[PDB]
Amino acid sequence: AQYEDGKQYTTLEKPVAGAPQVLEFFSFFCPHCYQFEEVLHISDNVKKKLPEGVKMTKYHVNFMGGDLGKDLTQAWAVAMALGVEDKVTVPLFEGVQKTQTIRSASDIRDVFINAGIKGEEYDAAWNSFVVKSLVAQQEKAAADVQLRGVPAMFVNGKYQLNPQGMDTSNMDVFVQQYADTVKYLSEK
Numbered sequence: 001a002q003y004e005d006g007k008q009y010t011t012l013e014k015p016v017a018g019a020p021q022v023l024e025f026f027s028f029f030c031p032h033c034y035q036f037e038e039v040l041h042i043s044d045n046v047k048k049k050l051p052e053g054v055k056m057t058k059y060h061v062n063f064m065g066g067d068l069g070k071d072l073t074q075a076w077a078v079a080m081a082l083g084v085e086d087k088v089t090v091p092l093f094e095g096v097q098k099t100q101t102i103r104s105a106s107d108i109r110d111v112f113i114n115a116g117i118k119g120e121e122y123d124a125a126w127n128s129f130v131v132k133s134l135v136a137q138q139e140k141a142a143a144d145v146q147l148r149g150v151p152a153m154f155v156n157g158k159y160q161l162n163p164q165g166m167d168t169s170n171m172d173v174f175v176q177q178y179a180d181t182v183k184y185l186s187e188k
Contacts, residue, residue, distance in 0.1 A: 019157025020057035029065040077134035155185040
């Protein structure tokens with residue numbers, strides 16, 4: 001066939017029930033994740049090819065960057081709670097990987113302040129049980145799929161994207177193959 005298990009995707013030996021429809025995992029420490037966000041705009045192109053009513057979920061992971069990695073997972077929970085993902089994603093990536101000006105929780109917080117989230121509002125969220133539960137959700141989702149690498153995308157808790165088996169000569173062609181594969185898996 002044109003789409004083949006073990007080629008553009010792999011199938012989970014242990015499918016995950018009640019999973020988000022499109023589930024993406026990333027780390028702000030992850031170099032291909034940076035590319036996926038700033039150069040390729042994967043999430044956005046996948047969305048444009050998904051049907052009506054399909055929600056996309058994106059979670060941060062702990063297993064890169066040690067203590068700061070965990071802070072980032074909590075900060076991402078804050079972004080999700082406040083709905084400010086689209087305002088902090090780029091400066092968090094650049095602060096970690098480009099300028100390397102993010103070295104502490106306080107430096108993460110600065111990114112949010114500069115993005116216009118108020119101090120009182122950020123700290124309140126940071127310490128909230130709603131954010132604690134949101135951290136727990138990110139951890140559980142990654143645990144459920146035995147996750148040891150990012151970037152990762154899972155469709156319906158059964159299929160996992162396999163970008164190593166797509167062409168990389170053309171950046172644009174790669175993105176469409178990726179997005180088209182997600183759509184195919186989605187209709188499966």
